[PDB]
Design a protein around this ligand. Structure first.
Ligand SMILES: [Fe+3]
Lengths: 53, 48
């Protein structure tokens, strides 16, 4: 009987570690939420009657 | 985050905060409620 490990092959349903400062790979899901927050943030009121701060 | 359910570029006014304008009129004075003096009452007072 053969399996993915028996032939030094990646499992049919396999996952990679999230990317780090030096190695690539997936991104963490909350990182995806973060970047989707950065683009089109609609975070609060940007200006109130032309006033900020 | 929001003011009165408004987000983003929002301009609020007196009626937006349930407030009265500078040039706003009240209910005229009657026999049961206090208010602005009517024109007829002022004319009658002046004539008397
Ligand atoms: Fe008033």
């Amino acid at each position: 009987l053969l399996d993915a490990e028996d032939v030094h092959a990646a499992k049919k349903s396999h996952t990679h570690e999230v990317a780090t400062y030096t190695t690539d790979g997936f991104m963490s899901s909350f990182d995806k939420q973060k970047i989707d927050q950065l683009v089109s943030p609609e975070a609060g009121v940007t200006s109130i009657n032309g006033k900020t701060g | 985050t929001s003011i009165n359910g408004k987000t983003g570029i929002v301009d609020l006014f007196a009626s937006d905060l349930d407030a009265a304008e500078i040039n706003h009129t009240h209910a005229e004075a009657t026999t049961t409620e206090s208010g602005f003096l009517s024109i007829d009452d002022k004319e009658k007072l002046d004539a008397i």
